[PDB]
Every structure is written in structure tokens, then in C-alpha cells.
Amino acid sequence: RVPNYEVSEKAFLLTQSKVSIEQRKEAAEFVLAKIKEEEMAPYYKYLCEEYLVNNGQSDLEHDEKSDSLNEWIKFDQELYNELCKKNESKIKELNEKIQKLEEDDEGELEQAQAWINLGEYYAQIGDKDNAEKTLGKSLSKAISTGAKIDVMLTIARLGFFYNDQLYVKEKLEAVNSMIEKGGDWERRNRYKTYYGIHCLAVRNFKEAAKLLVDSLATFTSIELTSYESIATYASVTGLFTLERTDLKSKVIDSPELLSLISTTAALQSISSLTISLYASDYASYFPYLLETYANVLIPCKYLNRHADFFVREMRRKVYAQLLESYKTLSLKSMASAFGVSVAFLDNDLGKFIPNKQLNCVIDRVNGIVETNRPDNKNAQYHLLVKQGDGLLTKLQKYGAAVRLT
Amino acid sequence: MTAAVTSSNIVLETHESGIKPYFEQKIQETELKIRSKTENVRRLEAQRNAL
Amino acid sequence: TTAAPLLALLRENQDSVKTYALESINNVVDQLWSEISNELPDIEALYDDDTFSDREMAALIASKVYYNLGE
Amino acid sequence: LSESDKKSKLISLYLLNLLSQNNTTKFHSELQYLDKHIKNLEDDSLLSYPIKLDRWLMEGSYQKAWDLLQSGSQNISEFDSFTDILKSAIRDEIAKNTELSYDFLPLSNIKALLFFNNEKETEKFALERNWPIVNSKVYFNNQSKEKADYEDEMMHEEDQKTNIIEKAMDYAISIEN
Amino acid sequence: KMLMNLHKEQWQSGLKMYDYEEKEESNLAATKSMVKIAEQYSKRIEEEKELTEEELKTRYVGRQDPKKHLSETADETLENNIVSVLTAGVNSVAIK
Amino acid sequence: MSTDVAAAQAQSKIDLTKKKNEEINKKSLEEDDEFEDFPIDTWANGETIKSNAVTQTNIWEENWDDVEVDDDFTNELKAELDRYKRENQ
Amino acid sequence: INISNNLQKALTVKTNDELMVIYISNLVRSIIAFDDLIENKIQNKKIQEQ
Amino acid sequence: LHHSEKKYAEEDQVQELLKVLNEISKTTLTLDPRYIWRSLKDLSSLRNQELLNAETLCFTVNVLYPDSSSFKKNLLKFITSNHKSSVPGSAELRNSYPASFYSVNTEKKTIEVTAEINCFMHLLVQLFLWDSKELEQLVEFNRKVVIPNLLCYYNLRSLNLINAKLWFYIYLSHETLARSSEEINSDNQNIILRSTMMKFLKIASLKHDNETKAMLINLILRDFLNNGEVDSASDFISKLEYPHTDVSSSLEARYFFYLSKINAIQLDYSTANEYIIAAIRKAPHNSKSLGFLQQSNKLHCCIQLLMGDIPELSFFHQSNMQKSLLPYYHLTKAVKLGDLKKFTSTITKYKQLLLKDDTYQLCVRLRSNVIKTGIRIISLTYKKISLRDICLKLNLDSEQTVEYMVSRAIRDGVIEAKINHEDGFIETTELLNIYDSEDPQQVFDERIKFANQLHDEYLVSMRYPEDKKTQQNEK
Amino acid sequence: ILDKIFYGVLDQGNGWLYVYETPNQDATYDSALELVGQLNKVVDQLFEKASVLY
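^ inputs. structure came back:
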């Protein structure tokens, strides 16, 4: 249960070259210790494969080379003893015990539940295939709706653990139908927090945000990352999606956020960036931005990959908000407020003009920035012809295949 | 089927073979009408049957 | 090959040069008809001339070109 | 017998001749035909000339195009009979551009652009291209609109414009048939 | 012939129109209403899993058809906007 | 790799004679081999094995961030370079 | 004219959807025709006999 | 052993024989026979290989031969002369059957219905030579025979379907040989190859058959592309006779690919778009077809860019073809950024690859597109900037240089600006609205016409299966 | 401005405040975008009944 998420966070950092040496190896000690301890040794075969030429790459099952800085990739005979030892005791016990629950005379209580028991052991050790098979048998036979959704979450979590998204994707779509059959508002909440994470992995912050505000109030952590983590995640999604006033309601005046305070390095920096956007403070916006890149995006396992997209967007957001409010500005004026030079400003501005968010021309003769606004009825017109053109493609191609038949 | 491996009296045999599909070509341009006819008559007739 | 040299040779003044050129066209009148369609008013011009003495082949070359087009 | 020095010589002249009619379509057709065997075999060593030139015309980089004529001197024989035609065309393409770009310019800046060494030769090309320089200033506010209109007047696609009324009718019959 | 003609200000009327405020209103109402039966329309084709045309209509209420109400409302607003453009576009150029 | 009965799986497609016709005929332009010819020659890029596949052929949708390869180092240097002048005024 | 296009695109789904439904009716009519074809096989032996 | 293989193979062939002979002897069934032939042929070439390579020869042995025994004996002897009851007319298992060619009838030469069958037997043979790559002499010999052999027939519609497929291999084997290695022999036969197709295309219009006609137009458009004769391809397009009446989807798909190439070299880009998109859509999306799609996708970059629309980054990103289209991705990125230096670097490194696909000639022209984009970018950002500053940024030579690029850009209207040389800056004249233009009218017309087009296509198609089930007995 | 109280833009350089009334949007277009979305779902679904055919 609880050991599965916390080990994988740390293990991902072991892969990263973006974290400091100090940090990387703080993590590397935590990993190795709790794999030997809880018998996550089947997953350790995967994980050596996953580090492999990023940092970690001297191994006794993969690539031999000395550009490894990690020793916590490398196998040990201590590790091999651990594997064998634990595996044989536990397995031996659990196979004969389970079998008897299914053997004896009762197939709606005891037989269903025993398959859960096999499933805990496969889920513990991180073998996906053999967890999917056993827990298939429980679902197939008839049981409570509540149990049906709950079992299925564990399978989904195994994808999240491996850092494979297609596997999650298959699972929660199935679960989603069964939610209204049970009529359970508790496990709709637990569904929401899972879907949050799925939307987060792929680039789609729009759904992430709707769910993440929901996950602050309610969720009880069931093989998912802390509420400190979720609170942080809600902040980041909050800025991206929502306009000034909705930023104010949902993030700043959140009873949930206010009551958890700032007790970690990543939450401390993000809460500072939300306030400065809102305050029309511009001096401290660029400093806060650099700190959130290091301390929020990078240590993530979901916004480390979206880092580039995210930092590009906020940079575009701050420039936009000032221009939306101001018909004219000077390059010198705008640049003093932000704390960058005039030259440095002009570049970043002229990069973002063709992307049509900023909507401003910039003169070099007088140094004034004029703010045009061609988005209106004209805007909605470009979108329609474009999406309609696509729809047409779909109609002809599906149509022609069938007419032939 | 027509032959043109052997010919006799200075291509008399195959002179006649050449002009027999060309006589019938007059009739084949009229058959291209009757070949779209088969499709459109059955099309509007089934249309008439639902009405 | 291309039959364009033969058409260029039509333009030259001697009758002798043009009569030879039209015969060369006939070897590949349905077999290389593409250029002849485009430069067709020259062959017709040679028919319309009454001082040209290979009128009869110019009319034939033309005839053939219109047959190949579908006309 | 597909190799001679005069082969390279003539290839260059044929191509110069295609540019000098000012139809780049006959050029690109020839260029795809030349690019196999012929171009590789003879290599570029006078082929270099008509190809770079043509390229400088797609670009609108007449500074390079005009420069090429001058380097023509070194291989001078009968490339001169095309170079004269090419100058008047190079000057023409610029004049076409200058109309839409801006509307009036001082006499010295027009001279510089159209390439003349004397102010008077600039006003002589003005009169041929039907443009009035008065008080040492050209005007396109009148002229550009005038030339486009006489040309744009045609009675074979000016009765075809596709009316608004026509478009409504056209949709209309598609729904019930 | 007397009986077939029933109007006499039919010629005037065919070149009049209403205020254009209520035309814009019909166009908005039409598009927004078709979203609301488009939602049902997706749900309908989840089903169509029951053998027999009649069984389908009785059991899953296949008669209350979303299909019928979209086609008809699209048709109505559509036919109208063909005429509207036709009338208005005639009026400006003909009169002036 | 087949799931359920083969009845459902004959009902969801029977291969077309039309497709047979399309495939072979196209192959004449594809030379002797041109299905694997390009990724054979270039050796599938000359680069580190790693473990991600979100550089090229990502699962999530392609958004343009190919423009800058890393504008985070750049923004750092810009800020710091003004920082000095400002402070020391 | 925008609205006419968007309204017309709705009608492109309607018309296309129906197509699939007919090919369903054709699909059913071949199973039915098979049962008939079996009954008619048997009928032919009677003809020979009598 | 060897005797066993022959009988086992021959039997399999008899089955296939039966199916096709029934169609032609029961009057043409047109679309139907073309479908049957392709499926049988795929099965049969694959068969040919196993159980001896005298599989083709067995079929010739137990059937009448107007001229088929002669060809089969030439082929066999070449590939080592062999005697095992393999000299045609040796084994007899026809036994007075009309099907398998009546005994009595043949002597007299009363039956002469081998012709169509002959086309088909040759047809398997051409394809087996191609898979093997023992084309060479064998292929040239078949080609020799078969030209007087079609002119010995005064063709029928069913036989035109088969000879439309013979014609596919006949063009191709010449290409194969020439593509090994330039030979003096190759040159002589090219001019020959062009002539014969032309000549036969005129006859096949009159007999009135779609397959022979469409196929020949395609082979000849491809002949034109190799020789760089754009003019001969144009007059060819202008012939107009290309039908849509019954033509296969294989022939249309190839047809549109050629069209895209032909327009782009003669400086028309507008009309090349429609076809390069059409050509992807008609082609199917299989692995055995993947190669054709790689060709189309490379072309789609040039065509689109020259017209002045940037093609999807996405389309090339999220393919499997990404490695083939790796140099081409780098073309698209260069244009996007406007960087000259980038585009020049790309085309140097990958030059050998680009030449094979014949995208390279189009790349010389794509140089022009890079430059306009670089200055396009500067105009959108910056309403007023001195042409002095424009020179620094894109690293141009003088003040005259910067003027002449911008001046041409505005003739075509792409930048859309005004240059001021006596106020010392370029000032954008961008209206940049199209909602208060008569332009939307013009867009919506296409969208509406396409939509109605499809409503008719649903209506027409729908009836034909309904009619057939009605003919058949049911309740 | 950002709180949308008077819907204007403050021109800094000429020391003027341009006051504008509420930006209008064509409500008719906005409903057109809602329709197009629904239509895209539906055609995937058409195709799903249309694969039972083959």
C-alpha cells in the first residue's frame, strides 16, 4: 500500500540529471533500503532498466560503462539473498491458505476475497501482468459495486508506479461507468483524485484543474501521494487555467490551502507565485518564477516533462496581463517593473507575438508598445472554419469505406 | 478467337478482323447508355416502392 | 526522342527540308503525337499553301492528330 | 557522342534565352530535363551562371542578379547578346515592385535602385514606363490604379464574379434535389 | 383561376421582410436548441442493440426520437437563412 | 493474439480484394525496399538509448516547444545581467 | 451563411448515419434468405420425386 | 518425389481455373472478374515457390496451347532443362471435358478459347520473375512474345481487365533493368517502351475499357517524370480522356501523386495541394503500403510551403515515419524560424537521401520561402523598425539588400508593408481583419458544396445492395 | 480593469484613460462552437456501428 508511491518518487529523482548530486543521493539511499525491506525486488529489475543512460548505467543486467555516478543502480548478492529469502516464505504460506478459501464451500464471500489476497502480493512486488489476471477473476464474479471500483484503482496505480500512461488510460475509463451503478459519493471523490493524476501526466490541465480543487477537500490517500503534494499540484494548475477572479476564490481563499500552510519547499515557492500575479507586483514575479522551476516542476514526476510548456506559458501570461490593461507602455517602463533590461525584454516579447496571446505591435522609433485587439467576432470565425474543415474529412473517409461495402 | 500469326492474300484475313469491332463500336456507344440505365432504373424504382 | 526538331525543320525555307521532315513525323504520328497538337497550325499552313507539293501528307498528319485527341 | 565542350557552352546559352523571354516556366521544365545525366556529366562550369541568376530572381535579390551580368565579361563571346535583354528585364521587375512598396521617392534614391549612373537616364525610363517625375518625385497614387484598371477591364470573366444572389440560389436547389 | 389566386399584395410582400433583431434571435435559438437534443442524440446511439424495429421503440422509447427533432429544426433554420440572404441581397442592388 | 471467438472477428472485417490491388501496385514506386530503407541507413539516430519516447512520438499531443531548446538557462542569464547594473546604481 | 454551413454539417451526420442502418437491414436479409435457401433445397427433391 | 509435386500443384490450379472460366463463358460480369483475379494471383505466386518451380508449367501441360507450350518450354530449359513428364501435352487428365479442353476439338482447332487464360498464365509468370529477381532474360522474352500476341487478338472486355495487369509488369521490368546500371541497351528500349504504350492506348479507348485506359495514362505520366519532359506530360494531361467510371482505387491514387509532382515543377502550387491530400486518402494505410505514404508525406512538405502555408509539425511528429521524415522535419523548422543558416546546413548533410526521392530539386526553390518568413516574422512583431536594424538582425549585406527582398515581398503581398526611405523606417500597413471583408462568403461556398455532395453520395449508394437481396428468394 | 468594473484601457503616455463600453461577442457564433464539438463525438460513434458491417 503506502510504501509503493513514496519509493517511486524518490527513484524517479535517481533517474533525473536535473536534481543536485546531494539530492539525487539523498533519494538513492531511501530507494535501496525500502526495496530490500518490503521485497520490491521484482520492481528493482525494471528500475535499473529505467535509469539507463541518464544517471545509472553500470549494471549486472544492462550496459557496462563508467559514466555512471550511481551505485544504487548496481545489483548486490545482498539484494539476491533478500529476493529469494522473503519470496519463498511468503509465497508458500499464502498459496496454500488462499486455495482453501476458494476450495471450501462458499464462492460469493470467500473465493472472491482470496483473489484480492493474491492480488495484494503481486501489487506489493510490482508485477503488473499477474495482478491484472487475479483481480480480473474477482471482478468477473459478482460482488459489491464499491469493491469492484476499489480493486480496479489498485490496477490503475500500477501504471502510475511504472511511469507508463497507456496502462492507466485503459483502466479508469472502465471504472467510470460503474460509479453511478454503486451510487457512492465517497468513491466518486477517490475516482476524482485518480483521474486528476491521469489528466496531469498527459498535457491537458483543463480537466486536471476542475478535479484538483475537488481533491483538496476530500480524498483519503489510498496508494497516492500526500496531501502536501496534492495541495501543491492544485496551485500550479490553478494559475494556468483560471482568470484573475477565479484565481482569487479557488486558490487564495481556499480554506484547505489556508489551513495546510507552507511546510515544504515546493508549496512555499508556489503560493508566493500565485499572490504576486494577483497583486500586480512584477518585480518579484520573475524571481518567484525561477524558484518554482527548480523546486516544483523538476521534483515532480508529471510536470518535469511538462516543464518547458508550463514556463513558456506563465512568461506569456504576465506580459499578457499588463498589456490587456494598458493601451500604451514604454519598453523602458515595462522592463523596469519586471527587473530585466530593455534589450532582454524586447526579445521575449517578439518571440511571443506570432503566437497570438499577447496581441501587441512594438515600435523602435519612439519605444512605445501599441496594443491592438483583432480578437472579437473575427476570432471565433477562424476557429469554426478550421474545425469544420476537419469534420468534413471525417465524414468523407468514414462514408467512403462503408459505401464500398 | 481471331488469329494474326498467319495471314493470307496480303493481310485480307486480318483487314476484315479489324473492321468487325469497328462496326460494332457504333452499337457499343449506345450500350454505355443502357449500362448506366440498369443502375438508375433500379434506383428510382426502389425509391418508388418505399413511396 | 522528341518530334520537335522535325517541326523546327518545317520552318526553314527549302521545300526539300520540309518534305523530309513531315515523313519523319509519320513514323511516330500516333506514337509521339503530343508536340504535333501544339504546333498544329504549322502543318495546316503547309496544306493551305498551294506552292507546297507534299500537301497530301500534311493533311494526313493533321488527320491523325485529331484522331488521337478524341476529335 | 554526348561529350563536347560546346555542349556546356550551348546549355548555358539556351537557358539565358529562357530567362530573357521572362517566362521562368520554360526554364524550370528544361531544368528538370538537364538535372540528370547532362548536368552531372558536363558538371557546372557555365551552368553555374544561368541557374544562380534565376534563383536571385525568385528571391528578389536583384543586387546579386545585376552583379552576375558583370562577371559575364570574363567568358565574353556571345553571352552579351542575352545580357542586354536581361538588364532591361531586371530593371522592369524592380519597377513592378516599387509601385506597391511605396508611393513617392526623391530622384537620387530611384536612380540608385533602377541602376543608372546619371539622373537623366532615370527620367527617360520613367516616360517609357509611364510614370511622371515632377519636382523630382515619382507618384504611384495615380498610375498604379490606372494601369491595373485598363488591364483588369475584360469581358470574359467580369460577367463572372459569382453574385451573392447567385450563391443563394445555387445552395437552394441542392437541398430539394 | 379566380379561386387559385387568393392574394393580391403577394408581390409586395415577397420583397418585404421583418425586423432583423428577431432573425438573429431565431438563429441563436436554433443553434442552442440543437446542442440540447445533440446531447440525447449521442446517448441514443449507445443503444440500438435490441433486435427488431418494434421492440426497440417500445422498450427504449425509440419513439420520442432525438433524430427526428434535430433533422427538422436544422431544416427549418436552414431553409430560412437561404431565403433571408436571397431577399436582402436582391433588395440592396435592385432598388439602388 | 485473438480474443473471444472468431465469429465476432469475421464480423468486424473480412479482408478486401480491393486492398490487395492497391498494395502491390504501389510497391513499384517503393523500389526493391523503401519500407525499411531510410531507418536502416540513418541507424535510427546516433544518440543515447535513455528510456523516454516523449522527445519524438510523444503520447501526449504535440505543442510547439521545439522553437527554444532551453529558454530557462537563457532567462536566468538575462535576469542576472540586469540584476548587477540595477543593484550597483 | 456561417449558420447555413453549421446547420448543413448537422445534416451531413444525419444522412450518413442512416446509411449504416440500411446496411444492417441488408445484413439481416442475407441470414433470412439463407433459411429460405435451405427450405427450397428440400422442395426441389419433391419435384424430382413427383 | 518430383512426379508427386506436379500432380498436387496442378490440382490446386484446376480449382482456380474453374472459377474464372465460368465467368467468361457465362458472359462478362465486368467489376466482378477483376476482383476474383487479384485474390487468386496473391495466393498463386506464393504457391509457385513451394513444391517445385514448375507449378506454372503443369497448368500449361493439361490445357490447349495456341502458343503457351512454346513460351513454357523456353522458360524451363533456361532454368536448367529437365524431364520428369514436363514437356507440355505429356500427361493427359482432360479426358474429353469441355472445361479442361475437349480432346477431339483441339486437333481440328475447333476450340480457341485459351486467349484470356494465356494472359493470366503469363501474368503469374511476370510476377514470379519479379519476386525471384531472375527477371533479366526471362522477362524480356515474355515481353517479346506478348506484344504481337495482343495484336493477334481483337480484344474483349474481360481480356482487357487481365492485360491491364500485364501492362503493369511490362513497364516495370524495363525500369528495373535500367535502374541496375546504365546500359546502351537500356537507352534503345526506353524509346520503344514509350511508343508501344502510346499506340495501344488509342486502341483501348475504342474497345471501351476503363482499366486498360487508366493504367496506360499512369505508366506514361511516370515515364515523363523520369526524363524531365514536363511539356510532354502537360499535353498528355490536356488530352482529357481519364475516366472515373469503373477505374480501380489503386490507379486513381497513383494518378493523383503524379499530378502533384507535375504542377509543382512548373510553378503552380495551388492546385497541387488538393491532389497531394487526395492521394493520401485514396491510398490505404497498411504496412505493405507504408512506403507510398512515406513518398507522399515528403512531397506534402514542399508543396504546402511554396504556396505559403506551414504544414503540421504534428503530422510528422506522431508518425512512425518520423525517421524517414527526419531531414524533412528539419526543413520545416528552418522555414518556421526564418533562419537561413539552418536551411542551408540541413540540405548539405542529407543531400544523398533527398536526391533519391526527387524532393531535392524542389528544395532549391524552398530556399526562397525561408528568407520571406524571416522578414515576415519581424514585420508582425514590429510595426516601425528602421531597415538598418532589419539588416543587423538577419545578417544581410547592405541597406540596398534589405530593401529589395521586402520590395518583392509586398508585390506578392506576403509581408504587406510600406517602405519609407525618407523617414528611415518600414511601417506596417496591416489591416489584419477579414470579418468585414467579402472573403467569408467565398470560404463558405466550398464547405456547403462539399456537404451536399456527400448527401447525394449517401443517397445513390444506399439502394444497390437493397436491390440484390430483393432479387434473391427470402421471406 | 482586470476586475472588469468599467471595461477600458488606461493610455499611459498621453496621460489619458479611454473608457469603452462592454466588448460584444456574437452570441450566435458562440453557440456554433458548442454545436461543432457535439458533432465530432457523434461521428466516432457512427463509425463504431459502421464496423459491425464489414
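The CA atoms of residues 237 and 296 of chain H lie 21 Å apart. Chain H has 22 helices and three strands.
thumbs up if we can close this ticket
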